[PDB]
Amino acid sequence: YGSDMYKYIEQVTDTQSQDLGKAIENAIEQGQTKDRQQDKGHEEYKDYEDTITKS
């Protein structure tokens, strides 16, 4: 009797669910760098200029 009978009359499937997730990620990064530059320079030059005048 009652209304609930209709649920059985037409096959009714009630489905539920619940997913509860948790996630913690911890990352530690360290880095070191070492550089070294060594240069050398050398330049040499020569010039000549001759001026002759008449007046």
Partner: protein
């Protein structure tokens, strides 16, 4: 872990505290002899209450894992420091990583409450409460803010 906390409150702060922590009927005296009477949690009779009048009230703050804490600081096992407002200690997602938890007292003074996976007992908490802010100098200021009201 219940801690008594005695404080001096102005009229507005006293009224707010009384209404939050329900008081059925009680008379509060002030610094300067003025009083306010609560009856059936409603203000009924107040004497001549000037500004800056101080009322003494003692409130119990209880520190437990299940109940919320207004302001605390948590240190992870990795080395991260975080601050949480108004949540219980158990409300942390991963309490497993947490190493130390210090209560914060609005003076920027930390008191250890959680170490080594367990709460700090009452007496060690009293020791740390004394110990946290030793050299705290408070500004000395006195104004009477009153005179015998009647003509005498």
């Amino acid at each position: 872990l219940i801690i008594k906390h005695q404080m001096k409150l102005h009229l507005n702060e006293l009224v707010d505290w009384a209404w939050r922590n329900g008081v059925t009927s009680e008379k509060f005296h002030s610094n300067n002899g003025s009083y306010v009477i609560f009856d059936h949690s409603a203000v009924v009779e107040t004497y001549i209450i000037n500004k800056n009048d101080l009322f003494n009230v003692t409130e119990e703050i209880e520190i437990t894992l299940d109940k919320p804490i207004d302001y605390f600081l948590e240190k992870d096992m990795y080395g991260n420091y975080r601050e949480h407002f108004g949540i219980a200690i158990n409300d942390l997602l991963f309490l497993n990583t947490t190493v130390n938890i210090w209560l914060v007292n609005d003076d920027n003074s930390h008191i250890l409450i959680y170490k080594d996976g367990k709460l700090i007992d009452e007496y060690m908490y009293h020791q740390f409460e004394y110990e946290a802010n030793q050299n705290k100098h408070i500004y000395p200021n006195n104004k009477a803010s009153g005179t015998y009201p009647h003509k005498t």
